[PDB]
Design a binder for this molecule. Sequence first.
Ligand SMILES: [Zn+2]
Length: 362
Amino acid sequence: FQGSHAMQPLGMYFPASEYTKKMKLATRCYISEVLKTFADLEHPLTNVEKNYFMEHPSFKHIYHLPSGYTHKLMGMWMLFLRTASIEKKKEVWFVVNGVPIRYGIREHALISGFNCKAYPANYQSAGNMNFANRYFKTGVIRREDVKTKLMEMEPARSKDRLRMAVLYFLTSIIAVPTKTGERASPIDDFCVRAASDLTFCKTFPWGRYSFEYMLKSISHTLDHFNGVVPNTQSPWPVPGFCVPLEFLAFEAIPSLRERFIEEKEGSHAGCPRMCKVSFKRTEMKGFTLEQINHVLGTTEVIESIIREKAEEVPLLAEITGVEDDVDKHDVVVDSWMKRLGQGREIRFEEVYNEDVHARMEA
DNA sequence: CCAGTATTAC
DNA sequence: AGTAATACTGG
Ligand SMILES: [Zn+2]
């Protein structure tokens, strides 16, 4: 279609030789564990405690997910293998079958429903160490120490138990440590202070915070592999709220959505995407890379920026800002947004051919 | 056997 | 701390 041209990316993180190399990816996003822990407390959660989470502006959507939530990661890996080298730092783009797909804060909000508005002024000063100092010796607080303390606390007049549950939720789902066990990494210091203030925790843009944390994991992952995927059974951790990334490829590519996604009946059309769809069950715990690659086939039907539906416009207006945040100057991405703005699609024929060849003919 | 996962070891 | 290896889970 005639129109302004999209420039090819200055580089890619991996060559197409790596598109068939599988990998075990370890998540750090303990949705199932947190929900199970909450349901199994010997002293059950109070109505106020339960409604804090079930009515939380962001975290209410974690309850619209299937029980025993299990992440499926080969869609994300397929995208990771096609990450473009760009100048922007606040968004990532993946080139599938020659078509750039964007993971920005808007997409993170559309799928999660989490508040992705701008940070309030001097948010880093929120809360204080008083609450944590009431329950943890000076030193390192591990994610498991918060879980243990939560299960060993007695519900009573003060909301300290609710604060602990909030801390557990934040540091298991939103900003989550990689290392576990006896020497587990210290949990996020901001979350420890923020959990002291339940009102602040209800309004803070945890969508932006989880998004920025996921951007860090993406960069660490790409640096780690440095262009080559090893032949190993050792899993690589990609910590943080990865649900938008797990579903992104399926939401942007109809061939994948049709074969691997099903509508979640009972869901409200006002909810974000994660509450309205679910992965179809297969004979395996997750989809294999070969399955994703095969269903990818030769399709050219791919949305660069996943489009919202009418029933979702109020939600996005409620959880996103009006203008995009300032980022580094990026003439390549600029050319993409120009061509997309004119109503034209983007597909680099050569890149498309290499993707198809790498997946289906060698 | 598998992909996702929890846990210890290097 | 950062990373890698082992082996369990629910099929
Ligand atoms: Zn929802």
